[PDB]
Amino acid sequence: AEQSLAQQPWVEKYRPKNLDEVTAQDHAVTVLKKTLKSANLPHMLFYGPPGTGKTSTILALTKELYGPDLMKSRILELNASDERGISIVREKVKNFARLTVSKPSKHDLENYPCPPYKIIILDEADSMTADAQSALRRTMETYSGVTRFCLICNYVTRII
Amino acid sequence: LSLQLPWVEKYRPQVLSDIVGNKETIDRLQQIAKDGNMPHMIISGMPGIGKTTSVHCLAHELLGRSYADGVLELNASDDRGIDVVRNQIKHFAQKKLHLPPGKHKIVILDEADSMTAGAQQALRRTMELYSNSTRFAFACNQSNKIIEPLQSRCAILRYSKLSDEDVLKRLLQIIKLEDVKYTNDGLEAIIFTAEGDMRQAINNLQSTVAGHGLVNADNVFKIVDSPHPLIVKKMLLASNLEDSIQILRTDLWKKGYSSIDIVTTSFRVTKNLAQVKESVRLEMIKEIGLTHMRILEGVGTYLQLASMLAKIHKLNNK
Amino acid sequence: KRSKENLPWVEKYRPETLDEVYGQNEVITTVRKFVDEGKLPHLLFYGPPGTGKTSTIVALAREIYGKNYSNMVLELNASDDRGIDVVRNQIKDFASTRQIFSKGFKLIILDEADAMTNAAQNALRRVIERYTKNTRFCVLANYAHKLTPALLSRCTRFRFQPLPQEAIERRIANVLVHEKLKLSPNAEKALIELSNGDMRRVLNVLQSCKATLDNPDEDEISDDVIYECCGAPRPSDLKAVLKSILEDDWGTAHYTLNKVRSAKGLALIDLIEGIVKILEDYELQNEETRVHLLTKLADIEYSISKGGNDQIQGSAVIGAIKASFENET
Amino acid sequence: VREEDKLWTVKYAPTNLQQVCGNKGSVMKLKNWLANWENSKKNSFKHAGKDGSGVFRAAMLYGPPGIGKTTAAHLVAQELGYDILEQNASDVRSKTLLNAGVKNALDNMSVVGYFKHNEEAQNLNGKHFVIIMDEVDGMSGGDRGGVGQLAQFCRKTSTPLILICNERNLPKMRPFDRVCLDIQFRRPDANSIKSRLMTIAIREKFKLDPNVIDRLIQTTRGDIRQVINLLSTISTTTKTINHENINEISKAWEKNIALKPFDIAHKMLDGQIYSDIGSRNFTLNDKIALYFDDFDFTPLMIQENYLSTRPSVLKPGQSHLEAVAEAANCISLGDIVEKKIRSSEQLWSLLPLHAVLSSVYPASKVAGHMAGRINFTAWLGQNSKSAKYYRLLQEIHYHTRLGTSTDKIGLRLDYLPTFRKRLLDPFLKQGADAISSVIEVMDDYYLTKEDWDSIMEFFVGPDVTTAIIKKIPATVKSGFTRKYNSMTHPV
Amino acid sequence: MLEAKFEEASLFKRIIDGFKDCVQLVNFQCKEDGIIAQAVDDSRVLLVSLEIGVEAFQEYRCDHPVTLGMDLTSLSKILRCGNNTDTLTLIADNTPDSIILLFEDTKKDRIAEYSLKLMDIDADFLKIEELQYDSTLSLPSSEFSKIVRDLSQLSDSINIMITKETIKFVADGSGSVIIKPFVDMEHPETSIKLEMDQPVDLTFGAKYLLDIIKGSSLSDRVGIRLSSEAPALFQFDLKSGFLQFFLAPKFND
Amino acid sequence: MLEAKFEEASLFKRIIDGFKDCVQLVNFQCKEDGIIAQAVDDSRVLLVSLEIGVEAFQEYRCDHPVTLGMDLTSLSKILRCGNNTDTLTLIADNTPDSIILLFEDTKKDRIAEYSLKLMDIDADFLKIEELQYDSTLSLPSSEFSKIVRDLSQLSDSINIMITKETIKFVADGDIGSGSVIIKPFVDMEHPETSIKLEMDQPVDLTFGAKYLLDIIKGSSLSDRVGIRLSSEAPALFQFDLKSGFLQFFLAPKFND
Ligand SMILES: Nc1ncnc2c1ncn2[C@@H]1O[C@H](COP(=O)(O)OP(=O)(O)OP(O)(O)=S)[C@@H](O)[C@H]1O
Ligand SMILES: Nc1ncnc2c1ncn2[C@@H]1O[C@H](COP(=O)(O)OP(=O)(O)OP(O)(O)=S)[C@@H](O)[C@H]1O
Ligand SMILES: Nc1ncnc2c1ncn2[C@@H]1O[C@H](COP(=O)(O)OP(=O)(O)OP(O)(O)=S)[C@@H](O)[C@H]1O
Ligand SMILES: Nc1ncnc2c1ncn2[C@@H]1O[C@H](COP(=O)(O)OP(=O)(O)OP(O)(O)=S)[C@@H](O)[C@H]1O
Numbered sequence A: 001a002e003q004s005l006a007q008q009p010w011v012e013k014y015r016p017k018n019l020d021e022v023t024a025q026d027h028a029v030t031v032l033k034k035t036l037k038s039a040n041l042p043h044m045l046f047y048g049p050p051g052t053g054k055t056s057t058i059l060a061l062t063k064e065l066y067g068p069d070l071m072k073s074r075i076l077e078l079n080a081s082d083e084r085g086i087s088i089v090r091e092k093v094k095n096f097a098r099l100t101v102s103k104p105s106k107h108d109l110e111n112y113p114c115p116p117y118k119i120i121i122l123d124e125a126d127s128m129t130a131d132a133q134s135a136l137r138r139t140m141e142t143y144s145g146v147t148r149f150c151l152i153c154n155y156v157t158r159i160i
Numbered sequence B: 001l002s003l004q005l006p007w008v009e010k011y012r013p014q015v016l017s018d019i020v021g022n023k024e025t026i027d028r029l030q031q032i033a034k035d036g037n038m039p040h041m042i043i044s045g046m047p048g049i050g051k052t053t054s055v056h057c058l059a060h061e062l063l064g065r066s067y068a069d070g071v072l073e074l075n076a077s078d079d080r081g082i083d084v085v086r087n088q089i090k091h092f093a094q095k096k097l098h099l100p101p102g103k104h105k106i107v108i109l110d111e112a113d114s115m116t117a118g119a120q121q122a123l124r125r126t127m128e129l130y131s132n133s134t135r136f137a138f139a140c141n142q143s144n145k146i147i148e149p150l151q152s153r154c155a156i157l158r159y160s161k162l163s164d165e166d167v168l169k170r171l172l173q174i175i176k177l178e179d180v181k182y183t184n185d186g187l188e189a190i191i192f193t194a195e196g197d198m199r200q201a202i203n204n205l206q207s208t209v210a211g212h213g214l215v216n217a218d219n220v221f222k223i224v225d226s227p228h229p230l231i232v233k234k235m236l237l238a239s240n241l242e243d244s245i246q247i248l249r250t251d252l253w254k255k256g257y258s259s260i261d262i263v264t265t266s267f268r269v270t271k272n273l274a275q276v277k278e279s280v281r282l283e284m285i286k287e288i289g290l291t292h293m294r295i296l297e298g299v300g301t302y303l304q305l306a307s308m309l310a311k312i313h314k315l316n317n318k
Numbered sequence C: 001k002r003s004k005e006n007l008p009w010v011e012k013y014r015p016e017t018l019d020e021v022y023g024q025n026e027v028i029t030t031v032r033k034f035v036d037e038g039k040l041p042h043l044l045f046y047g048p049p050g051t052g053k054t055s056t057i058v059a060l061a062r063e064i065y066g067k068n069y070s071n072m073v074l075e076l077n078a079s080d081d082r083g084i085d086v087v088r089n090q091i092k093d094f095a096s097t098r099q100i101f102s103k104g105f106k107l108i109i110l111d112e113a114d115a116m117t118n119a120a121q122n123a124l125r126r127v128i129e130r131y132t133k134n135t136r137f138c139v140l141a142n143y144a145h146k147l148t149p150a151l152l153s154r155c156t157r158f159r160f161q162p163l164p165q166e167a168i169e170r171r172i173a174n175v176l177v178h179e180k181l182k183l184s185p186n187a188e189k190a191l192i193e194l195s196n197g198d199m200r201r202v203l204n205v206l207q208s209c210k211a212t213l214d215n216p217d218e219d220e221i222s223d224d225v226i227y228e229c230c231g232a233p234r235p236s237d238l239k240a241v242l243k244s245i246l247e248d249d250w251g252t253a254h255y256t257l258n259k260v261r262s263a264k265g266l267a268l269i270d271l272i273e274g275i276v277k278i279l280e281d282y283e284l285q286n287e288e289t290r291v292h293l294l295t296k297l298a299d300i301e302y303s304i305s306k307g308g309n310d311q312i313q314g315s316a317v318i319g320a321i322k323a324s325f326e327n328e329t
Numbered sequence D: 001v002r003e004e005d006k007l008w009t010v011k012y013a014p015t016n017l018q019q020v021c022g023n024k025g026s027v028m029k030l031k032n033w034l035a036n037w038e039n040s041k042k043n044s045f046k047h048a049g050k051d052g053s054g055v056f057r058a059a060m061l062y063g064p065p066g067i068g069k070t071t072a073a074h075l076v077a078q079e080l081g082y083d084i085l086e087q088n089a090s091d092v093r094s095k096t097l098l099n100a101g102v103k104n105a106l107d108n109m110s111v112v113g114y115f116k117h118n119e120e121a122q123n124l125n126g127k128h129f130v131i132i133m134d135e136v137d138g139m140s141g142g143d144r145g146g147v148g149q150l151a152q153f154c155r156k157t158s159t160p161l162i163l164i165c166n167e168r169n170l171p172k173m174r175p176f177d178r179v180c181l182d183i184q185f186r187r188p189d190a191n192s193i194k195s196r197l198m199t200i201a202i203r204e205k206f207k208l209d210p211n212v213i214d215r216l217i218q219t220t221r222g223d224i225r226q227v228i229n230l231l232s233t234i235s236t237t238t239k240t241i242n243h244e245n246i247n248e249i250s251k252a253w254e255k256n257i258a259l260k261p262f263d264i265a266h267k268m269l270d271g272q273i274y275s276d277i278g279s280r281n282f283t284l285n286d287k288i289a290l291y292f293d294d295f296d297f298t299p300l301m302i303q304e305n306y307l308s309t310r311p312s313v314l315k316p317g318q319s320h321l322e323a324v325a326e327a328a329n330c331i332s333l334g335d336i337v338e339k340k341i342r343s344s345e346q347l348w349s350l351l352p353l354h355a356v357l358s359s360v361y362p363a364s365k366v367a368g369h370m371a372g373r374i375n376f377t378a379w380l381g382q383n384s385k386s387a388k389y390y391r392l393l394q395e396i397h398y399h400t401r402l403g404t405s406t407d408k409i410g411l412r413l414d415y416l417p418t419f420r421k422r423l424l425d426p427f428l429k430q431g432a433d434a435i436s437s438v439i440e441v442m443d444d445y446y447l448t449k450e451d452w453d454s455i456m457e458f459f460v461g462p463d464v465t466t467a468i469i470k471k472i473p474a475t476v477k478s479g480f481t482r483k484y485n486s487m488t489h490p491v
Numbered sequence E: 001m002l003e004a005k006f007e008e009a010s011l012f013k014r015i016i017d018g019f020k021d022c023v024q025l026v027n028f029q030c031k032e033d034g035i036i037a038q039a040v041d042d043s044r045v046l047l048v049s050l051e052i053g054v055e056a057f058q059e060y061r062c063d064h065p066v067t068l069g070m071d072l073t074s075l076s077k078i079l080r081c082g083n084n085t086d087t088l089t090l091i092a093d094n095t096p097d098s099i100i101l102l103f104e105d106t107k108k109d110r111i112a113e114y115s116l117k118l119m120d121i122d123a124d125f126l127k128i129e130e131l132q133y134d135s136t137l138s139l140p141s142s143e144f145s146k147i148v149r150d151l152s153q154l155s156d157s158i159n160i161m162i163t164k165e166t167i168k169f170v171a172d173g174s175g176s177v178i179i180k181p182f183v184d185m186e187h188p189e190t191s192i193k194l195e196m197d198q199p200v201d202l203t204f205g206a207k208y209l210l211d212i213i214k215g216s217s218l219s220d221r222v223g224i225r226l227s228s229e230a231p232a233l234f235q236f237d238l239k240s241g242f243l244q245f246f247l248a249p250k251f252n253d
Numbered sequence F: 001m002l003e004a005k006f007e008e009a010s011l012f013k014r015i016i017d018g019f020k021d022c023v024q025l026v027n028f029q030c031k032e033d034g035i036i037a038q039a040v041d042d043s044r045v046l047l048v049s050l051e052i053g054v055e056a057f058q059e060y061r062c063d064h065p066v067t068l069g070m071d072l073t074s075l076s077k078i079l080r081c082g083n084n085t086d087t088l089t090l091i092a093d094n095t096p097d098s099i100i101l102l103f104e105d106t107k108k109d110r111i112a113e114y115s116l117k118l119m120d121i122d123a124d125f126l127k128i129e130e131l132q133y134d135s136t137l138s139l140p141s142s143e144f145s146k147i148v149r150d151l152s153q154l155s156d157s158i159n160i161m162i163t164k165e166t167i168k169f170v171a172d173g174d175i176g177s178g179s180v181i182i183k184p185f186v187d188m189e190h191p192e193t194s195i196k197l198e199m200d201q202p203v204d205l206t207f208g209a210k211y212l213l214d215i216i217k218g219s220s221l222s223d224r225v226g227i228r229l230s231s232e233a234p235a236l237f238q239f240d241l242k243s244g245f246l247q248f249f250l251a252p253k254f255n256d
């Protein structure tokens, strides 16, 4: 994996891997780092100019939280590449949110602090429709104990 | 637990005389029920003035005990597509039923403005053929949504807004039948906020009675939240920009009204602003629409409404 | 492993009963009188985001039936399908039957009914009143223009006033009792002003500020901590920027704006809001100053809402303020 | 059956052709057509009669609602001794079901007709059919048989086929024009209906002043049935209809009819409503609701014919050109709003703003008198032509992408003049011997003869090829296309 | 009040099934002698008449003649519920706004009543007084259904020709079937009888004959009566009554 | 840990086909007694309750009471992917995670190990089947299905009336009306075709036909369906299995 990173351009080569690598936002990284020792993680809404660390800091937080083993089975990632529509937000997002958290192995349960909730990261939520964000409202509120929601955007006004 | 019906349904008139609506049309329907030769009728008017109650009492008084089999009521909840109109309504129109001499089977199509045009096209000859045994009564809010041929075969009954006197009379009737302490100022406030809507008036009266017991302008304005389109109309006609801004901030914004709702209400009020001229109305509507376009794109802060009012004043003052 | 403490402060402090819902006293008293007397008319809660509509309706559903409300109550939210076929089959079947669990009037909670199509509302317009002695309807909304006038007239209208200051102080006191924490008076007032009626942002930023103390049991949340956690501009820097723009010349005003917005990483969208909020109180001795001051600033805000630039819009705000403050002299 | 249970419109229905008030000429022409239908059938409908109606198998009655179309058809059917087989909108009409049910009755005879009357010889057409299709406009269940099957039935019938409709100029009804014979029932005048209502009032024991009939037919423009229903409804309580209650009766029984995409523009561009007097008789709310009759064509019509009027609302100092400029600015703003409406987020709450910006504001800015006749929108066909040309350009571009290495637009903008110079002019200046060079240069760019034909029509302005192509001799074209179908082409 | 009782519901079920596809509404008159019902096609090309006397009913009671107008789709929907082991009873009261069909089980305590709401049909009951048909023939029903199925598969128009006491069924590729009248004493059911007065040349459509041959399940023999200026008559014999079809001819183009 | 190995394969298929298009989300509660589950309709009108003891399983081992929620569409998708000749084994770990379905052929080693991610349902377990029904009856499932899907063609509502030694199914609609009247009788040479009835008070109450058409789909399991009716109580339609029972609680329509 080291040769693949070395071959990759500097943008991906030096992508932050931990919460200490993002030396940009000491006001938002400490709140996420203190969530580690705690267990209450609120629904996150990262918003800001293009290229400031949002998509990188969310991946770093999910990694530092779950581990590379549980990472694949504990987080769902819906970016602008996927088809995010009212029907999709109603069916698939609710299906994954209304799910039982995966069982953490002894390795993960010993090394990484595994919280009792999954994470649905809707990246670039400023491209969603208004009806999809409307349907997301009670979806992100009822299953709040087994699922949290992290939205990422450049325009906070575009989000309802 | 014990549960009582609301005052809206408990005191719905079950007899055509108790209706306090338009006297001419109510007397016409009374004479029709007395004679029995009821024709097809499209009743159209504003929401909450007694059209459905009128047609229901008419059918009941006309059919007596035969209401169970001689009345087919299709509303917006039931299916009313091409298939339904062609099959069920036709099979009911041809249904052989022995009624008293001056009676007829009644088909009550409620919310007729939601039916498809093809359904009305298919219903035209169905109604025209069996007119000697089946009569049709449409009830709608927008008679323009009913096609011209269908509207042609029936009598048009336009219901006007309920005057303050009729709403006041029904209010005194309900109060006397309910033994409620009331002040004249509270009833006047209820009538003022009802916007000529019997259902809304009865609902606000019941809410005030159950909340405070004593119907008075204080409790009415406390629990009623005086109508929205009037405050926006007052705001749009302020003298200085400061007064309009203060009315927008204190009465609309602080009281928790959505910005898009404010823009929509301002547009609807400017649409019917008979005081100002045509060109100034059109320019104010254009600025309100620009503000609405800005609101729908996500940015809906108070600054946008402030700029809208500023542009409106810049237009109306110069 | 899922305990009660595994919830965010937005949902951890959800009001269980009507007694734990502050602010909307005028609505809650009449709702309690409704449920006590036994006649619950069709309710239409209309309110801004984060006021207490859903919490109040769930507390009412709990107090009416019992500690098991989801069993017999039917709740349709924006997450579910609410087409015309849904209203035809599901809601109409639930409205026309008896309860499987208890013997009482059923309750249909239509949450976020403003997201319903006009056809669905038109279809519900008749079923809401055909079955009245058996079921009741609750319609929750933030925009009262999406609802058709017919459906809007058939429901007792209750407007949820934004949370007044006293209720938010009461809830903050309750939280600080339920959570080992301390809050300064000036920091509490800053939080009140930053809330803008929203009851959820209060708890969100309160938890976020409790997360950035390094010890939450002794250190109190100062105004600086609150202002830094959300990145909002402090009133001192705001007043300094406004004074430098109004009094000083162009070069030093631009330098001051840049030095202030780069000392804490502020945003122009927040500086503009603070500037207009602090400038609406001035006694401008004409009507044309405020016109330009609002028009140009709203145009700049709309342009910022698209993320055009960051250094041209600052000079734009400076020039707009200066050109507006020229009719006075 | 009870006489009292009549609808006031069945008891007074015309029982003979002498009672159809209005359209005497049209009903007489229909009667003569149905009479000489057999004489025209003897000559196989090839020879036309004195009126030129003997060359049409089927008739089509069209006109406003409530004038007697169905009544006149039924009357001319029963008069001539035929047997009426009437199908209407309630019947499910569709190509399959129409071929199943009605097609067999086109060349057959009535079975009930044989048992009606056969002892005395009254006529030879007492056993025939008259298929009366009624309300053929409504074909929601006529997906393929609504206008397609009936058109073929009109040609391939052997029995009288009478169609009845309301709107003839509807684009759906296009196939019906050139196949059958259409007759127009106009809105009747105020004399025949006057006499009919006088007889009704005499036979109904109530008072009705003759001068009231004019306003009654006015408020009910062409709807006699509506007049009868209006009399029936009000005769229950008030027995005197005179000039003391005509105002309320008329105002309460107005016809809220719709408007067509043609007269909508004429009304909205009429400079009288925007005057200070007309502004409160036809309010702005009515002007906005006028847009809601047809929100598909109204902006297009307004944009088509907003500068073809003579204004009357010009402010002192404001000329015509600046008024058209402001109107076009508002049209552009309305187009922006319309794009924002039919785009993502499905913003439909912005419809009245679009109505004001696109329709109402330019009208109010250029409201005057129409110069000539109102023109239909031309953007509708121009967009289709542009799409058809874009498809051809896309085909040519993806054929030549192997050699050009340029975008689709830069091809049309830049390469096409050189392609014309290399492909067409060698045929004009060198005759038929430059065939090999043209074939080779088309082979290098993977072009075809259809690609050449598509390229040729593209050029505009001075370079117009559709006229130059007819100047090159006709034999060299044949030689070129024959040489093309002989040599092989690697795609 | 009328009360009729079939000993077996299967007879009425098959009677309804015989002509359930050519018409939708039908007027059953009810007199003292029996039940007669005629119904005209929606295209007014095919008439269907039927007569069932008291010989089919186990019990028959009709005080006053009454006309029951009923749809055939709803009647078939109601009839499909009953079983072939139950006794059917038609019941009607004075001013019959409805009609009761009672299925009673002889060996089980199950009684199922089905009420049907009658229709208001403009009963223009045309007299069926006898017309002297030019040709009167009879042949087995099964072979008739077969030959109609064969000729209809080729084209739609069906020509029928009765000349020189010989039968021609032609369909215009082109198909033809020739029938000669031969009476067999050994098998009396297959005796194609033919009484000819004048040569008859008629022409009919396909679907009408396809629907008439559907009734080739109640009688083993069909009677065809033809005349050049009169509709064709196809009669099926019953245990008590008869089921006749009147088909209008085609043009002479 | 939980191991439930069935005797056959199509048993669970037929058991699940009862609520194919009747309900969506179910929560199987597995204890030492057996598998008990219940599911409320999407419109919260009918409730399905299934109980299967340790009699239908070939092997059963449940350490602690577990509760596994799952959607029925995904469960049917998984169940259709197994051949009807293998064996079905429900396997669950210590903590409730994705349930493991196992298909093992008895002649060739073919191990089909499917995993179904559980759904988190608000399992508000009530206490039903503990109420007294004023009327009870039992009749063959074929006759009940016949009556139901014959009366469903004339209307959408069906009124059941239990009177003194008589059962009456009435369907009142537009095209007409139907009424089936049956009487209690017990045959000795055919005890399965007997119709039994025990009534204490006369009962009359209506139901929807769209729900009865789905209830009668459970007639593929047993041949004698029982019906328990009571005023101010849900109607109990019970099919008796060789190991447990499948019961539908239907809510009666409210008459005016
Ligand atoms: N805070 C940061 N610390 C370190 N490297 C960073 C930081 N922000 C951005 N980078 C670098 O920039 C790359 C892209 O960062 P991203 O997180 O994708 O930016 P972004 O916020 O996602 O911009 P978007 O998605 O277009 S709004 C990373 O792989 C790093 O190499
Ligand atoms: N004229 C009236 N007199 C007395 N009560 C009335 C009158 N009009 C309405 N109501 C009351 O209004 C309620 C029923 O009104 P509706 O039938 O809903 O009005 P509507 O004319 O049908 O308008 P819609 O159907 O909502 S568009 C009952 O509580 C009636 O008592
Ligand atoms: N009046 C109130 N008293 C106490 N806490 C409140 C109040 N209103 C809101 N909250 C808090 O805010 C949380 C969310 O409130 P909700 O009532 O769910 O918001 P909402 O009324 O549904 O508005 P929407 O639906 O998001 S637009 C609750 O769980 C409480 O923690
Ligand atoms: N010219 C007329 N003279 C007398 N009565 C008329 C006349 N036109 C219509 N009527 C009356 O209108 C009724 C018949 O309606 P028609 O006009 O025949 O319907 P229509 O012309 O087919 O229009 P449609 O089909 O409803 S759009 C009867 O009551 C007639 O008496």
Ligand SMILES: [Mg+2]
Pocket (backbone or CB within 6 Å): A054, A055, A056
């Ligand atoms: Mg990114």
Ligand SMILES: [Mg+2]
Pocket (backbone or CB within 6 Å): B051, B052, B053, B110
């Ligand atoms: Mg109504």
Ligand SMILES: [Mg+2]
Pocket (backbone or CB within 6 Å): C053, C054, C111, C112, C140
């Ligand atoms: Mg809510």
Ligand SMILES: [Mg+2]
Pocket (backbone or CB within 6 Å): D069, D070, D134, D135, D164
């Ligand atoms: Mg007509």
